[PDB]
Amino acid sequence: PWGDELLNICMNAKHHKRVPSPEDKLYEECIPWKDNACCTLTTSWEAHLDVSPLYNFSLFHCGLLMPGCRKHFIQAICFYECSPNLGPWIQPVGERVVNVPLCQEDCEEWWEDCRMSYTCKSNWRGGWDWSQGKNRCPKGAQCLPFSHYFPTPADLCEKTWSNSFKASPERRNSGRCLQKWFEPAQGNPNVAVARLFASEF
Template sequence: MFGKITVVTILLGLFANHGKSALMSPSCPRGDYQKESPSGQEHLAACKQYTCNSCCFENITTQLAIMPIQQVGKLNYEQCGKLTDACSTQHTYLQCLYQCSPNLYPWMIESTRKLIAIPLCASFCDQWFFTCSADMTCAPGDGNWKTGLNKGFDASGNPVDACQPGVICRNYTETYGSGEVLCNNIWGTLFKYSTDTNNCIDPSNPTHNSEVVKSINSSYTTSICETEVYTDTGMIIGIVFGVLGGIFLIAAGIAFYMRQKKNKKPAGKSAPAKPTSEEMSTLRVQPSADTPPNTREGSDIAED
């Protein structure tokens, strides 16, 4: 009897550990622009903090690199006119988090890979609301974009995102009234407002998010690029070679100027001409005043 109980206990323990491992294993949300599991070295046009370990493919980040944000997939961010740059930045943070972050799997339903109730930091939600307070949005009374936006394609195949019948454009202040209502409603049940600073997710701070996931699952070490790693390497190389090239050109110009100055002759003066052979033949050496006269040349002088 004891042996059977021990075996059953061991099997239940293995099953429980396996279930936990499967639930906590790094994976990506199910989407048109996302991988099944995170990997590195994608050439991302935006969201470069996730280059070392991303859930997204490059194609979606080309849309997220536009400022202000205009369209992501079927979602038209210009539903009620262009967003301000400040509001656009907040939305880009959120899209990068959702599309690219490898650190959202603790809030994922394993069977469907659907995310739910991601705890967004209150500080981020409040900043999001503040920066977008005067921007316009097309949303029903509760501000849920999932029900207030009419996503699809027009006859030409272009994505559309018009307000549904009875829904009008209003600013964020009228629609939400606070950062808490904004985070709790704009994407349905995807996010929730959290004041727990040690366990909330901040879309603008991937390093913090990595630490939060480590506290949940210490066996998984996340990988987030530091600023110096994901800064555009090509741009840095171009700047370095540009500076070196400029220094070389300046040095060459100075050397050329000094050489020209050294070889330049004073104006109005020229080197004396070399005498001709005829002139050389007529030259005679004149005796100096101290040289005694030759007696033979003086013999014709009459003596007294």
């Protein structure tokens, strides 16, 4: 009836805490989740590393990103690693997440701030030159504005993370899409979306 089975849980992937709980301290962008997190301090720190050990996927592949852009990607990581409100979208590939509806503002802002940064591919989920241990752009892949490879916010949200996120037409505070970051002062707006979706009325 109400999917409490699907609430307040952490996915079984390699870094996640087995169950959520509060943290005395989390690093920078992961702070909004310290109330109740699926990430340890270490994990929150690791998320901010260049070529973070969490995925060994390099963001610098077309050169260092603008910091504004880098910030968005880190927040994406904090969210994926820290959110206790992902149950409805957990699925096995050992678990992952599929088509989490990110509010339009989150995808729009992300897209906006990454326009000026450079990448070489539009489907980051695979097809990279992997020889150094980290991905490099494959033979002849041109470094160009993000707005070239991801013409829309939707492209960006969805394809960078192997369709972990769905760009939702829904906007923020509709009760029907999640934010990848939120101001800690203002309290977690994703709790109630979870509830809605667990029942998924």
